[PDB]
């Protein structure tokens, strides 16, 4: 959930002083800094998957080579989702645009994805968008041979926990009241709060600095790249017989994908 600094100061004041009504104000010394969202790992441990979509077959039943253009189109609909699952609300906005570079174990492709982490909410944000892959290549079909050109889309999916972290220094000015009267007017650090209650994802790091260690995620599934996979096989009329072969032609990389 979200640790509300003020509500927890409210609770501290009531417990410590017996106040029944509390009013706090962030001191102008109050600061949030070293905001940092970091992925717990960076190698997706699930391999990308090649999916075959359709194939285009061309039979060259003649005695001369032919050139043939095969063209494919595919529209993939795909999703990205991020959220903070353990956060903090201080007096000012705390957020980070983070960009992540993920690799895949056992291979060589890299994907780039970015998300906005607002530390003060658990609201989740998802974008679903379509992408139109289009690819074509010109193949030479030997005589008495057919070709099967299969369009392959290489899919990747990822679900990565991230650390949602910052430091805080400074104090709140707190007024406690009981039975129609002000009974307390004290300053309380966020470090002091961390010493008081160790169950708030805050730790006293010394020098008056409290560190917040919360969490969230970045998750997604997209096409990473298209491949045209070409198989030549002899037709029955071949006789001399063409030699069967499968070779692969790179189609396209996704915009956010690199090697």
């Amino acid at each position: 959930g979200i640790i509300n600094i003020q509500d927890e100061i409210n609770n501290y004041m009531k417990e410590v002083y017996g106040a029944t009504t509390v009013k706090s104000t962030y001191d102008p010394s109050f600061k949030v800094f070293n905001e940092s969202v970091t992925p717990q790992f960076t190698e997706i441990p699930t391999e990308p998957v090649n999916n075959q979509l359709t194939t285009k077959r061309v039979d060259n039943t003649g005695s001369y080579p032919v050139e043939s253009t095969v063209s494919f189109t595919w529209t993939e609909t795909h999703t990205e989702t991020s959220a903070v699952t353990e956060g903090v609300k201080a007096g000012t906005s705390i957020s980070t645009k983070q960009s992540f570079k993920f690799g895949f174990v056992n291979s060589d492709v890299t994907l780039t994805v970015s998300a906005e982490y607002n530390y003060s909410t658990t609201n989740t944000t998802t974008t679903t968008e379509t992408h139109t892959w289009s690819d074509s290549t010109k193949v030479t079909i030997p005589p008495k041979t057919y070709v099967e050109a299969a369009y392959i889309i290489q899919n990747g999916t990822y679900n990565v926990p991230v650390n949602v972290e910052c430091d805080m220094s400074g104090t709140l000015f707190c007024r406690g009241y009981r039975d129609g009267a002000l009974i307390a007017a004290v300053y309380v650090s966020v470090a002091d709060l961390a010493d008081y209650n160790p169950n708030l994802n805050l730790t006293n790091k010394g020098d008056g600095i409290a560190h917040f260690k919360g969490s969230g995620f970045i998750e997604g599934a997209q096409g990473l790249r298209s491949i045209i996979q070409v198989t030549e096989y002899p037709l029955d009329d071949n006789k001399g017989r063409s030699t069967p072969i499968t070779y692969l032609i790179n189609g396209s990389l996704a915009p956010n994908v690199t090697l």
Partner: protein
């Protein structure tokens, strides 16, 4: 150079009782479709066909030139047992899908939740 090639195959068929009971074969080849080889085989024993959700196998292999292997192509004739008569299909052998090592392939069946996937890796033998 000869390589130890380790294939990890997973079988899927939506239908609630433990794992599927695949029978048939799956084969691979490097670049020449006539030089294919089985990486998995199970004869149709109907009701006695073994439960199999994941299958692992290591095979020694090499290319035409003994160069490193960049490519492998897979296909399968993989079925599930005729509860009544007509078998579930997890893979059709007309469908060939290739990948580099580290990329996994899917062979599609007759439904979105019936299919097979294959992952492979290589180390010098």
């Amino acid at each position: 150079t000869v390589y130890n090639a380790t294939f990890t195959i997973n079988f899927y068929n939506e239908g609630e009782w433990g794992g599927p009971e695949p029978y048939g074969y799956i084969k691979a080849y490097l670049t020449n479709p006539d030089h294919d080889f089985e990486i998995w085989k199970q004869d149709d024993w109907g009701k006695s066909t073994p439960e199999r959700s994941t299958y692992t196998q290591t095979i020694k292999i090499s290319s035409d030139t003994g160069s490193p292997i960049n490519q492998m192509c897979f296909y399968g004739d993989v079925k599930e047992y005729d509860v009544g008569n007509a078998d579930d299909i997890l893979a059709y052998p007309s469908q060939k899908v290739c990948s580099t090592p580290g990329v996994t392939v899917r062979l599609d069946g007759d439904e979105k939740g019936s299919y097979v996937t294959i992952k492979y890796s290589l180390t010098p033998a």
